[model samples]
Target: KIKPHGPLPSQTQLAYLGDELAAFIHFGPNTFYDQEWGTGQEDPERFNPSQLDAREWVRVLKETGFKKLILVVKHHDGFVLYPTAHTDYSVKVSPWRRGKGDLLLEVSQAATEFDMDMGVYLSPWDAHSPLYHVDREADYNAYYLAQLKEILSNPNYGNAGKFAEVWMNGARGEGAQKVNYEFEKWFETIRDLQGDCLIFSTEGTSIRWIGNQRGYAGDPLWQKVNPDKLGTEAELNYLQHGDPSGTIFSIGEADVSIRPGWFYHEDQDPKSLEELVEIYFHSVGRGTPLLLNIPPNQAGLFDAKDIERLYEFATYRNELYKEDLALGAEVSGPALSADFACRHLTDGLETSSWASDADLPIQLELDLGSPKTFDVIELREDLKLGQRIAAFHVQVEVDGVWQEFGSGHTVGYKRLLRGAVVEAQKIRVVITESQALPLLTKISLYKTP
Candidate 1:
């Protein structure tokens, strides 16, 4: 068994993972310009969401099963969503509310009202800032920090000192001239302001980008890696596949747009439900959180087609996991007596866990009280201890004969397995390999339509 040998994830990382699936709202001047990257020459008056409703945005996100919503407060084009004292080219100067509307405040308030966590994406590459291409690295760094401080500390336009994650893209656009960025200072500023918020970047301290914009993670993804040994360019490679014996716990986040473009376009259509299901299985199923991008249209509202697809995806998941067959089942296992009982496996809490003090090949048997048919199995490990299970399999008794149902490897925070439908009164899980005594917090069975 390849044991996870490094520092375990922090409480903030575990909380971030608990959000599981989040949505990225790539709204800004790019949505109006119909371009993925703006050139800083577009007119600010062109940005206007006539029927914009911040509450509507949160409503859609809540209904779609997205626990967090990352709003693009500032994109590469330097169009700020809130009124910043540093920049004049923002919604404060636009025609959104006659130069009086604050999009950030509205969205943040809406997120709080709807009981959803909010994140901010402040692009480090700003083409509109005059200091960006004039060989003024120090000035630009200070300017960026000032903006970040305002966002972190201020209550009106900022997140009211409550932000789940802060994303910083490593895209430095060189227009005519190049400008260097002092990332150390940027990270320090964030740490000083919001120590609990997780930072996401290509080579950030907390979270790393999962290589591509495609919504998929590596098959054998590791939660630990040697961040000191990896440079910015090498971080992508490590993010795709983590090192088994690394030092840091730089987790990966799979980001991809539901549409073809990061920003909404009239021609581009939302991804189909089938494609989304596959992406979910590859991303969340592969042990990494999925940051699915669902950009709002030019009207600052989710499009009907996109909303319909999200509804379909959420409905499907609710149908698949609405009930658990192993909730009150009788459980027994070898070397699982007294302190390490099997009842904790389906107790519906992560704090209590079923542990085996014995060696590998730990076998656990479950009797569902009566015959029940299910095709899905869900497993969760107490990640605070570290990912220990290397390989495991599920079996069921059919006419008094043990039959293999499903098998998988690497059960980290969560693992979902789908198999052929089988009616059985008894089932068993055999752990073939593990780094230590396996601690399982959850084991559930479901029947999918």
Candidate 2:
């Protein structure tokens, strides 16, 4: 057994890593205005929805296998979804619910009913707040913290026992007006109430952005990251792949909208099922959680096509992993002991891991007993220990020779790799590099067909 490599994941980080999929609900005045970024000039009456159904939003995402819900209670435009005490430009003044509907509360209630973890996407920039004085950081910081306090502490809106994550939107105001955001104080405030909640930002102390909203995590995405150059604009690639020898577990989370824009438009349509499939491979496949944004329409419900596409995606995923081809394989490796035996890899349990008693270059050969075809390779580390494996590859005994089929990097809680189909009676997993002795929980195979 080897010691933990670098920084270890917190309990919240562990829960997030296991979630795999999260829903990013981007809704606000932007949805009604058909704009990606509202100018903070829209009338509060424009925020009205014909039939706002928070239950439907939760239902669709929960059914699509999403475990967490990150609701945009406020956007860059400063249009608060809840009746925020500090501002009049909120749902309170809107005619949607007779000036009394708390959209945030409705969603939080829905989340509680659905048994899903909930988070908040509270934008940092406030273009509409009159108290947003650029020179006075304390004045605006107080206002921002006040709103945050209400959401995290107040039982009416955000108080559903506890919040799981907080998405700090990094966008500065699009125009000239900007305030020096007090993120440190904001983080401390979040921790005061929801201590276990993970904070998400490009310069994340807990979770970092995957550097792209196109729904793809960089290959070799390390859970560990150097906290020094994190928030800088020059660290795009650095933010994507992360520093291998860093001292913090700043895990990556890939985000993308279902359509072109984050908010819904009557002209816009959901992404095709094929594109969503590729996204799954690039995001969740690369050992990063996928935060998929599926914005609601003016009807205050997910569009019919959007709902249909989600279930379709869910069905496709279910079929892909419905059966694991690695089961019953005569797994052959160094049987360290009954407790750490290589047979655990094919036992269909991640809790029981197979620890190799070998040196740098290692192998776990699997003889399936008969030829079988597969296109997807699934890997997982018992991340309760920590992310250890850095790089690896798969080889298949094709015809008479063992040829390399595919390769992977940083197998954390889970990683799925997809490629052209291959038929073989035997296969080998080669761990080429690692920070410590790697203990893999599962090595399974799947077919797209």
Candidate 3:
């Protein structure tokens, strides 16, 4: 029977995975201070961006292939980017815009002009708010809830009250005063105003963290996970790989910065195009959405060098995947009847999937007609049928002899395997294991420079 197992995704979770790319903007006093974390005592007069252009941000990110833009509306320093009635320690007091600036408001407005979805990171660990003490749980929760409501209910966001994601974390900053956050209430309130928004946190209800800020995904990244085990001591290991049997369907988001720090600094430099490419294959290629952070300079614009690198990165990607060698190839497998025939594997139609009987280890062989030199092979499971393939291996006929070249696990949405470039007219994919009969949609081969 053709059926899928494991937890099914919510509508929001599925939408987020489809987007696949996001930009995390870490802008605020930190840009001017050249600090990672700020003390709440910094003078409001220190905040100033002489030439702030939020639209340029939206423009560059869209060009760089990002589908969403997330702003750090509030960092751990407790400084809010947008003005809220709950606190005076925000842009309302900043010297920027002559003490009347609203950073989030501008970004949200800029969001309207682009094809990207808007998201915000509202830090719950407040070091500056007087209502942040554990003893003041009621007041702190109230203030945070009110601020969240302001960001969610404001008519100035992407839609009237719509957001693609709400980024958060259980980052209890270094202090004796721990915050008892009522995440249940916050998630409920967020759903009320923005029903489509995904709440991201340590144990995010909707979106999961990839357990690192270095743009790496686990070798066997699974869409299913136990939210309870997230952010625990096993975060670096278990959270990275995820539990295949778990009921949660929150997909992991791989967050990383282009530079060494989250905020802009003159001394810092952006990652090399090679590094960015590697990160892309490891994250997005492994089915995790890449949240690449691009901090704006004090002048409120992306650095010239950084912007140039971004275009270079995009150009390289464009050239790397210029052609698909396996398209329209002759595919043969164990069963080639009905709609689940091997012909659907290389037809380039997402709706078409290849499946057979309850075969434990299914395999398919593709004849490319002529030997083609390539280094990258792409596999995608029929997500509509649920994540099915668990383990698989790829082999190529080198000089009329078949030998294994690459192997991997978890072909949830798309799994990219890169190895030493080889020339072969015949390619074979053997599914060593699976959850069911294993429904697969596409198998593509590309050469990388």
RMSD of each: 2.8, 1.6, 1.5
Query: Sorted on TM-score, highest at the top, how do the candidates line up?
Result: 3, 2, 1
Q: Tell me the deviation in Å of residue 156 in model 1.
A: 2.3
**Cα lDDT of model 2 by residue, 14-71, tens digit:** 8887788999999888887888987789898877785999999988889999999899
> Clashing residue pairs, candidate 1?
none
Model 1 TM-score?
A: 0.92
lDDT of 3 at 13: 74
Assess every candidate by TM-score: 0.92, 0.96, 0.97
Q: State the C-alpha lDDT per candidate.
A: 0.82, 0.84, 0.84
Candidate 1 lDDT over residue span 234-275, tens digit each: 655667877666677767888999999999999999999989
lDDT measured at residue 358 in model 2 versus the true structure, 0 to 100: 77
User: Which 10-residue window of candidate 3 scores lowest in summed lDDT?
Assistant: 230-239
Total residue pair clashes for candidate 1: 0
**What is the lDDT, from 0 to 100, of the residue 210 in candidate 2?**
76
Could you tell me which residue pairs clash in candidate 2? none
Question: What TM-score does structure 3 among the candidates reach?
Answer: 0.97
